């Protein structure tokens, strides 16, 4: 199926993201530490959505979205950005550069399931 | 600019499209004759948007719609279908297939325009 990139500098939270996928049914998840290892991944291609944590080192998650954007070959990758807290500032920061969408964490599986299937209404599945 | 994949089996049809995209400010503008050409082409990336023509001898446009769509790289491409009158059950055909948004001939600068947008907000936050 789709091939996630699950980005976050915390080994837990790549797990739990990881696995909330996998018990949503999309076993194609690889995952990125940050921004750059993000991005170096991402250059290769075949990659289908990016899920990616705010606060990371080397290149946070609002960074690897206004980059992703701002590159032709991943300007149409779905971006859920996965925040911490509430309706911060970040929301519109994140919806400034074009999020495809955010998660307040901790999310369950099914929020993690009612995003995504918004943000495929709106493109297509 | 974002660069588009004009899609028809007619030259003169690419044509238009091409020049009206370009007389919309969009001039990175990119042709395939037809369904596998056209995927044919996206294989090698860069492509951020696809509008295509419904009839095309090979592969039409709703093939084309679901191979890009079934891809789980390609997924989230944006697919505007180009129409014709006198074709109702084909705009809920394109619809289910996951098409962005579509177009009837004879389209216009400001028509293109105003669905470019619709579909280019209906794709982030």
Do not use: C
Not at 21 to 29: D, M, R, S
Not at 30 to 36: K, L, M, N, R
């Amino acid at each position: 199926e789709l091939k996630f990139l699950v980005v976050d500098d915390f080994s837990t939270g790549r797990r739990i993201v990881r696995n909330l996928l996998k018990e949503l049914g999309f076993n194609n998840v690889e995952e990125a530490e940050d921004g750059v290892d993000a991005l170096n991944k991402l250059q290769a291609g075949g990659y289908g959505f990016v899920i990616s944590d705010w606060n990371m080192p080397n290149m946070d998650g609002l960074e690897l979205l206004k980059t992703i954007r701002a590159d032709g070959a991943m300007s149409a990758l779905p971006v859920l950005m996965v925040t911490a807290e509430a309706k911060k500032e970040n929301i519109i920061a994140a919806a400034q550069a074009g999020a495809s969408g955010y998660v307040v964490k901790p999310f369950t599986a099914a929020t993690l399931e009612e995003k995504l299937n918004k943000i495929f209404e709106k493109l297509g599945m």
